[PDB]
């Protein structure tokens, strides 16, 4: 064989180039940096109204409003300052595992297993909420829809492919193929031009939403990737697998900076987020809890202990003022 | 210290919360019957003969069923099955006609899951007009030599059923249900009604501690 040898040696020698120019682990440099201590965080509010397992939760663009999706087929927009239910959206298919809040507060798009990423419009002339455009064309379950603009949305699915859609026209402008398993999480970059997705084949690949070109590819886990999010500066992203490991990749080093697993941890991660300063790596674990990982020392500097069921979604306000956490107990709590 | 608007805002919040409460109350009124099965297992036959993800909503004898066919999902990665916890009872489907070994393995995998550990299973093998015609060609040794009983459709089917249920690694908490009658007659639905009735009754008495 000729091309097989070329591919094998290509992988091996670019890996060797990565290794030779690799200086040292980050802990080797930031070891002398003092820790943060214990972030003992208190439940201020308690959002009750959902009567089914909570799955996904996205913060508002103004750090005030919230969106929450449950198995009761209800997407509910809340006010975090008064625990008031601003809107209540009855969905069609209750198998909803992901949905997010438009950066302009105009639209909320939310769907799931039924392979359609529906889009809802709030600031209507009639005072109610209607579905603007339902994005159909996938053949597998969706995950981590994300709004780029009011007419540009990024969606992953179980078809091993993420599709950039055009909300006005209703067609898939671009397709991002290259995964060998269900792509169950993606996060938009802060600049809204790059996005990283994690797939069930234990690898995450940084993708360009503009030319549909697979820029980077990442490995290091042993099982599927369960959550993915960007560092606030859009230069790194962390992932959480069923290996009970949270891993941080740098888009330029092309290598895993640090894992954030602890021996006592038995089960895998289900969601991950970041603090506004990017100092507190938050991660929702399966047992009952959320864990507050200092992203530089990988030490559990505080535990959010509620949620008599498994945590399924986290979120940190654009200003870092709060932390909303959701679990299958159908109760979201804001911790500060 | 509520402004003039904020009182109306709280009124609307209470209205929405009441609507959510009643919607969830209705959500707890309906039966959730997850349906699985390997290829050409007859799930299409089941759905057509009876009264991505596909939801089939029908009612029977004043009870409402919501059976969810996850067969459409082309990814056998089981990253969605855990959302189906709490279903009243699942429906494994298979037909007598080395596919049987794959069905055995799938049944074992479904039984041994942590998430269905306390969720009874309901197995249907309804089509009966052809299950017995093809037996004359050969016994259950085309790929299952262990069989040693007489090559008849009364004993062969019973042995297959026993081998399937033998995959039940924990009967203390969980039970198994089976059906064999011909699919043509309208008795498949009644068995679904009986099994759901019994499993809900056992869930009730289970809650009380009476069990």
């Amino acid at each position, epitope marked *: 064989d000729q091309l097989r040898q070329e591919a094998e040696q290509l992988k091996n020698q670019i890996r060797d180039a990565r290794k030779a120019c690799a200086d040292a682990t980050l802990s080797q440099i930031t070891n002398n940096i003092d820790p943060v201590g214990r972030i003992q965080m208190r439940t201020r509010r308690t959002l009750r109204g959902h009567l089914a397992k909570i799955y996904a939760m996205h913060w508002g663009t103004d750090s*005030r*409003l919230l969106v929450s999706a449950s198995q009761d087929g209800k997407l509910i927009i809340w*006010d975090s300052y008064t625990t*008031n239910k*601003v*809107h209540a959206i009855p969905l069609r298919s209750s198998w909803v595992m992901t949905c997010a809040y438009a950066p302009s507060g105009n639209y909320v798009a939310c769907g799931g297993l039924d392979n359609i990423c529906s889009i809802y419009n709030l600031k209507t*002339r*009639e*005072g*109610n909420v209607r579905v603007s455009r339902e994005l159909a064309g996938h053949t597998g379950y969706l995950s981590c829809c994300r709004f780029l603009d009011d007419n540009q949305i990024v969606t992953s699915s179980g078809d091993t492919t993420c599709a950039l859609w055009d909300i006005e026209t209703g067609q898939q402008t671009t397709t991002f193929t290259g995964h060998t398993g269900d792509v169950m999480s993606l996060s938009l970059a802060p600049d809204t031009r790059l996005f990283v997705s994690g797939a069930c084949d234990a690898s995450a690949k940084l993708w360009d939403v503009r030319e549909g070109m697979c820029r980077q590819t990442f490995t290091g886990h042993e099982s599927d990737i369960n959550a993915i999010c960007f560092f606030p500066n859009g230069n790194a992203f962390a992932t959480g697998s069923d290996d009970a490991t949270c891993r941080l990749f740098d888009l330029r080093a092309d290598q895993e900076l640090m894992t954030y697993s602890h021996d006592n941890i038995i089960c895998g991660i289900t969601s991950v987020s970041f603090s506004k300063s990017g100092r507190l790596l938050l991660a929702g674990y399966d047992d009952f809890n959320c864990n507050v990982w200092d992203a530089l020392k990988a030490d559990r500097a505080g535990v959010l202990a509620g949620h008599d069921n498994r945590v399924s979604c986290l979120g940190v306000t654009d200003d870092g003022m709060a932390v909303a956490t959701g679990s299958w107990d159908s109760f979201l709590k804001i911790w500060n | *210290t509520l*402004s*003039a*608007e*904020d*009182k*109306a*805002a709280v*009124e*609307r919040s209470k*209205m929405i919360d009441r609507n959510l409460r009643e919607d969830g109350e209705k959500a707890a009124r309906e039966v959730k019957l997850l349906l699985l099965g390997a290829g050409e297992s007859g799930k299409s036959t089941i759905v057509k003969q009876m009264k991505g993800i596909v939801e089939t909503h029908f009612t029977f004898k004043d009870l409402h069923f919501k059976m969810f066919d996850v067969g459409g999902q082309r990814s056998e990665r089981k990253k969605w099955i855990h959302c189906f916890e709490g279903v009243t009872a699942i429906i494994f489907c298979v037909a007598l006609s080395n596919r049987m070994h794959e069905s055995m393995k799938l049944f074992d995998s479904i039984c041994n899951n942590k998430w269905f550990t306390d969720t009874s299973i309901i197995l249907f093998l309804n089509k009966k007009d052809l299950f017995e015609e093809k037996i004359k060609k050969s016994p259950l040794t085309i790929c299952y030599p262990e069989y040693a009983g007489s090559n008849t459709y009364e004993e062969a089917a019973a042995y297959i059923q026993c081998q399937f249920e033998d995959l039940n690694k924990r009967k203390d908490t969980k039970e198994i249900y089976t059906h064999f009658t011909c699919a043509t007659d309208t008795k498949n639905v009644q068995f679904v009604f009986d099994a759901v009735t019994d499993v809900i009754i056992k869930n009730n008495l289970k809650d009380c501690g009476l069990f």
Partner: single-chain antibody, 232 residues
Framework: VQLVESGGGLVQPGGSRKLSCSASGFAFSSFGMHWVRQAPEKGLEWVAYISSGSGTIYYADTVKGRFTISRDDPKNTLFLQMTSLRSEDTAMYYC??????????????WGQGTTLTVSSSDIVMTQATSSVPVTPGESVSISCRSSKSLLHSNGNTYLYWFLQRPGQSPQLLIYRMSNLASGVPDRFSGSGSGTAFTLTISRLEAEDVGVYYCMQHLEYPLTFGAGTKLEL
């Protein structure tokens, strides 16, 4: 969105008339409904208010206990039934819808209105003048003063700016202090603090003429201003 009333006409004192507000073009069953009157060539004056779902009801102290408010959500019809009428009820009755949630404009759409004719503590809003001549292309500033400081502890400053073009019903411009309305040109702007509130209109055009007003929320009853009228 189309709010049209009926039941207007002439009635002798001591009788009981009834006013209907048929609504068509929005989700009436979620929109707080007010009633506002405009006595002839004097100005706007609040009457009543019914919240969503017939929960909370208020009245103006002038006619408190004499007017009644009915609401039919499944038919989208709002009634205002009057019992006894003196020589002051004669006015132009409008029908105004409202939604109160975080960030809403609850006084956006004003009904076409129905005229009524009858044969023969509270916050005070003071409007500086009643007539101001000006030509197109000139920046105009209007202002009205307040009794109490409208700045609630929330940070909100509940003041409303409308505009009544001649022969037409009012129209909202700024719904708390500087938050433009739905579909109003981005020309209108407002500012102020505590008790002095002003509306600035730069690059004035011909269709900007009419009687201005400043209405104040933050307590019931809702008291309008006297009303400045731009002239040209």
């Amino acid at each position: 969105v189309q709010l049209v009333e009926s039941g207007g006409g002439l009635v002798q004192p001591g009788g009981s008339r009834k006013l209907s507000c048929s609504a068509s073009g929005f989700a009436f069953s979620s929109f707080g409904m007010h009633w506002v009157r405009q006595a002839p060539e004097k100005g706007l004056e609040w009457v009543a208010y019914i919240s969503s779902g017939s929960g909370t009801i208020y009245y103006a102290d002038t006619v408190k206990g004499r007017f009644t408010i009915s609401r039919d959500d499944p038919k989208n019809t709002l009634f205002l039934q009057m019992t006894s009428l003196r020589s002051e009820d004669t006015a132009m009755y409008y029908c105004v819808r409202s939604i109160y949630y975080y960030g809403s404009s609850p006084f956006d759409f004003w009904g076409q209105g129905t005229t009524l004719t009858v044969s023969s503590s509270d916050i005070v809003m003071t409007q500086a003048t009643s007539s101001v001549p000006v030509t197109p292309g000139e920046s105009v500033s209007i202002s009205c003063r307040s009794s109490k400081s409208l700045l609630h502890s929330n940070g909100n400053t509940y003041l409303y700016w409308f505009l009544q073009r001649p022969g037409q019903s009012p129209q909202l411009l700024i719904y708390r202090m500087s938050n433009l309305a739905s579909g109003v040109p981005d020309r209108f702007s407002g500012s102020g603090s505590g008790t002095a509130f002003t509306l600035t209109i730069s690059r004035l055009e011909a269709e900007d003429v009419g009687v201005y007003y400043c209405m104040q929320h933050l307590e019931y009853p809702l008291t309008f201003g006297a009303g400045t009228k731009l002239e040209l």
